[PDB]
A paper describes a structure:
Extensive classification of the data for the mycobacterial ATP synthase revealed the presence of not only the three main states referred to as S1, S2, and S3 but also of substates within them. Substates S1a to S1e are in S1, and S3a to S3c are in S3. In S2 (where there are no resolved substates) the c-ring has traveled two c-monomers further round (ca.120°), and in state 3 substates S3a to S3c have all traveled on to approximately the same position, four c-monomers (or ca. 280°) further on. The main differences between the substates within each state are that the positions of the PS and F1 domains vary such that the F1-domain (including the α-helical coiled-coil of the γ-subunit) appears to pivot around the PS during the catalytic cycle. Each nucleotide binding site in the three α-subunits and in subunit βTP is occupied by an ATP molecule with an accompanying Mg2+ ion, while the site in subunit βDP has ADP and an accompanying Mg2+ ion. The sixth nucleotide binding site in subunit βE contains an ADP molecule with neither accompanying Mg2+ nor phosphate.
The membrane domain of the mycobacterial ATP synthase is embedded in the IPM, with the catalytic F1-domain of the enzyme extending into the bacterial cytoplasm and attached to the membrane domain by a central stalk and a peripheral stalk (PS). The mycobacterial rotor consists of a membrane-bound ring of nine c-subunits, attached to an elongated central stalk, made of single copies of the γ- and ε-subunits. The mycobacterial PS is made of two proteins, bδ and b′.
Author numbering:
A (entry chain a): 10 to 247
B (entry chain M), J (entry chain R), L (entry chain S), M (entry chain T): 2 to 86
C (entry chain b): 23 to 60
D (entry chain H): 3 to 120
E (entry chain d): 1 to 50
F (entry chain N), G (entry chain O), H (entry chain P), I (entry chain Q), K (entry chain L): 3 to 86
Write the structure that this text describes.
């Protein structure tokens, strides 16, 4: 079997259910990100030779700044740079940590992952996507006031396509979330399926799929961050 | 003596499967074609990216609108199956 | 059912938020300053 | 490598081997390498030609009234006029650019693109 | 349990392919960036001295 | 089992086919027309205003077909013809 | 089972197939013709008048087949052949 | 249940497949031929008469396929072979 | 139930698939070949006669598959294998 | 209550119908594309007709092959149905 | 007959349609986007880095539909809606 | 009665039909497109054939391998049917 | 009276057949289109063969990945059918 949709360490608080495994994975990713951030803050070298951590962080910042400048001037969207970079690093680390060999036997022949990519959980992707949705809608309201922005989004670039435009504002968040979830959820199944093979043959397809999943996770992080920057750019114009 | 609701909901599941199959085919291929246009324009005219992202996104909007209308109707089919007793 | 949301949502959001804050207060500003100085 | 030859109406300006030739035609930007297929194209009003040569800096030439011809062996650029990067004075091209006449404006923009400011 | 050994072997293969093909180019890019920034600083010092 | 169940299942499958075809057609046609428009604007930026006019004609035909299909789906699923 | 139930389910499925095929054909054909029209307009704006002539001929050849498909679906669903 | 019921349901589904395939083929082929014609007219305004004949041959072929399909579907639906 | 009824329904659906696929393939292939011929004639008017030979080869290749499908559908429907 | 071979042969007939549908779609469209390439090449270079037929024949072979293997396997499905107990 | 049996059979067929359509769309869309990227690079090789970004935007937009369909297929197959 | 194995065989035959139909469509279209590219390239350049066969062979292999994988799995479906009791 | 397991596995085989059909179509079409682009590039500019093989292989990865995901989910459908009783 595959036990799709199973969650471990599930608990209850304030009359609400929480998936302990996904919370743990998110906390681990956040800890890694914070550790890298503090490593950078310690090893900043304005005049000295930058360290690998500084090079990585500055590469991310440079790419995101270039994207924003191409879309909308930094002077108009300064916060979008930190938002996009944190989104990108969060998703990238979440996807990449799955490569580590945390898969074992479930005592019934069904594989169990000690660490599972949080993006495979609908709550994680929904949190990210809805936060971004609220963020750039608030930014658009701020640019075009509390009233002007709704008319602009409804009318879009051509007014007479107002209905379709409405659908767009519904499609942007959903497409932002589900996509990511899918691309990670699929992984959570592939490895599981590969686990059905005997070890002496299970090793190889697992290696191939995980090696490809590394690039898939990098691509997904890049796409999600780029589309976030892009939706911000759309929401803040005129 | 099959449960009428059982037949109805199985038919609804097959119908929604068709809805999303068609929607995904259309959306994927239309987005791919619009992207072909976009990358071609960027390669030929590097400075035209800003003036191209608008029409490309309008056409992508129409393409995605079709797909997500299909999404809404598939959700109606499976969760609020019309005609189900 | 795995597609349904949960309380985890809020928790995840909170975690993301704090990370964002850190990145906005101890990573992006110093890095942008370093690039500007360079 | 490919034999670049920048040929003006009055005199063959430049010649010699090169590894890459970047330019901008009416269809769009184009890059030419040793065995590029035979080609005939028209350079844009404010075209610029970048020539990357074996172990040398890129030769940036502003071109006015340009035509590109890629042969089985050689790449020839026929220019009504052309100017190597070193010979452009910034202020003159700046003032000529954003003018009324189209020829002078295009020539100034080509000079600017050669300079490296765009 | 057997799947555990299988995925350990898979991860060993992943680590080998990484360290053998991905590490060299990324390390070279890192060294190129470090050398470029070091050269920029050296040029700044030389220009100030000049 | 009552015949109404079979008729409703058939209607649902028919509507599924209707909207699958409609979405395929709409997506492909809109993508192709948008590709043409992007290529046109990729060369002559000022051409955008005059290009919108035929582009919207194409989009109207495509979406006209799609929405006819939608109307027939609504007829199939909500008021199923022949529903005994 | 009521035979008319089977007949109506089959008729609904067939009509759905008819409309799905017609939708795909109409949408994609209109998209391709509109792509041609858009490219032609982009290359030379003045040509619009002469371009709209063959474009309408193509649109007719496509939409006529689509509407024939629609009519045959209408036959299938409302007045089902061999309804019995 | 009447065997003729199953026969007629199968015939209706088959005819729907016939019409869907014919619709898709006719729409795509006519759209492509019209794209060729429109591009030719755009490039050469005076080539209308020269191009009509090739375009008509292409149409003729596509529409012949469509009409053969329609005839076979009519045979399927109104004169179902194997009916009993 | 009568086995012949199930067999005939299956054969009718199969033949409908035969001809639907044949229709799609023939229509699209003929459209593409006609597009090529129209473009060639527009570019090179004098080659109008010369181009038909490869065009006839292409159309023959497409119609070969189409009519093979037609014959096999006739086999499926009129003389259904496995009837019993 | 019905003959198992009856439903088995019905399924085999539907399967073979799919075999031919896919084979015909692929063959027709691929041959159309290859012929379009051949026509464009002949129009562009009149004297290349002698040399173009080689790659054209290779492509047509690669397409009609797939088609005829599909035909053979449909014949297997119908005339000698696997698992026709 | 067990209702859940027919429910799950219908759900499996539905999910098969879901992800088959998704796979077709993703394959063709990635093929087309990669074709555009490869042609652009072949024109000007050092446009490679400049072109990956729109290429990945297009790849994301295409894969969106495919992976949304994959998620809904997982819902269909693993948590079947309306499964008595 | 409706012998279970008969239903299994019918489903397997239809599944093999679908597998082969999709495989044939993919193979035919892909080979046709690759051959179109090859024919155009050879038409432009006489001697290009020698170097063009290499990428053309790569594409043909990548497409035909996908088709033959479907072939093998159809053979699995109709000869060793999974889940058959 | 039908064995529910037989219905489940018949539906599973149909679904797997659809999955393979769609995946094969997608992989074939995408690989053919990418190979057409590669052949056109090699014909136009042979010296950029190495530079072109990179985006070509990226596209082939992005296509074959979806294809093999379809393969894995189909193997799930047929060999370990979800919902099997």
């Amino acid at each position: 079997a595959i036990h799709v949709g199973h969650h471990t360490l599930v608990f209850e608080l304030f009359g609400m259910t929480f998936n302990g495994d996904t919370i743990l994975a998110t906390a681990v990713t956040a800890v890694i990100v914070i550790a890298l951030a503090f490593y950078l803050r310690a090893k900043v070298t304005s005049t000295g030779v930058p360290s690998g951590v500084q090079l990585f962080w500055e590469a991310l910042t440079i790419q995101m700044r270039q994207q924003i400048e191409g879309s909308i001037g930094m002077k108009i969207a300064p916060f979008v740079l930190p938002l996009s970079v944190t989104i990108f690093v969060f998703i990238l680390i979440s996807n990449w940590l799955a490569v580590l060999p945390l898969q074992y036997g479930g005592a019934d022949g069904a594989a169990a992952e000690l660490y599972k990519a949080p993006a495979s959980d609908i709550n994680f992707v929904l949190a990210l996507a809805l936060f971004v949705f609220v963020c750039y809608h608030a930014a658009g309201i701020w640019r075009r006031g509390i009233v002007g922005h709704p008319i602009k989004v409804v009318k879009g670039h051509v007014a007479f396509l107002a209905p379709i435009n409405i659908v767009e504002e519904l499609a942007k968040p959903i497409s932002l979330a589900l996509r990511l979830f899918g691309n990670i959820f699929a992984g959570g199944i592939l490895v599981a399926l590969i686990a059905m093979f005997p070890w002496y043959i299970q090793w190889f397809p697992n290696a191939v799929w995980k090696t490809f999943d590394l690039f898939v996770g990098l691509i997904q992080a890049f796409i999600f961050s780029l589309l976030t920057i892009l939706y911000f750019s759309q929401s803040m114009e005129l | 003596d099959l449960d009428p609701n059982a037949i109805i909901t199985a038919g609804a599941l097959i119908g929604g499967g068709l809805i999303m199959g068609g929607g995904a085919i259309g959306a994927g291929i239309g987005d791919g074609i619009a992207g072909n246009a976009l990358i071609s324009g960027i390669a030929r005219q590097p400075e035209a990216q800003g003036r191209l992202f608008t029409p490309f996104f309008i056409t992508v909007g129409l393409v995605e609108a079709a797909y997500f209308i299909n999404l809404a109707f598939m959700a109606l089919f499976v969760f609020a199956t019309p005609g189900l007793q | 059912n795995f597609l349904i949301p949960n309380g985890t949502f809020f928790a995840v959001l909170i975690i993301f938020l704090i990370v964002l804050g850190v990145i906005s207060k101890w990573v992006v500003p110093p890095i942008s300053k370093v690039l500007a100085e360079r | 490598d490919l034999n670049v030859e920048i040929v003006a109406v009055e005199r063959e300006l430049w010649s010699g081997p090169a590894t890459f030739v970047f330019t901008r035609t009416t269809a769009g930007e184009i890059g030419i390498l040793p065995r590029h297929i035979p080609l005939v194209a028209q350079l844009v009003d404010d075209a610029m030609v970048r020539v990357e040569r074996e172990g040398e800096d890129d030769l940036r030439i502003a071109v006015d009234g340009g035509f590109l011809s890629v042969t089985e062996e050689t790449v020839r650029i026929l220019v009504e006029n052309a100017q190597f990067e070193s010979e452009i004075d910034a202020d003159a091209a700046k003032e000529d650019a954003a003018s009324d006449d189209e020829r002078t404006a295009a020539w100034g923009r080509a000079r600017l693109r050669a300079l490296g400011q765009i | 349990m057997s799947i555990f050994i299988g995925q350990l072997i898979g991860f060993a293969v992943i680590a080998f392919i990484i360290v053998k093909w991905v590490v060299p180019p990324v390390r070279t890019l890192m060294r190129n960036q470090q050398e470029a920034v070091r050269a920029a600083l050296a040029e700044s010092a030389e220009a100030a001295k000049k």
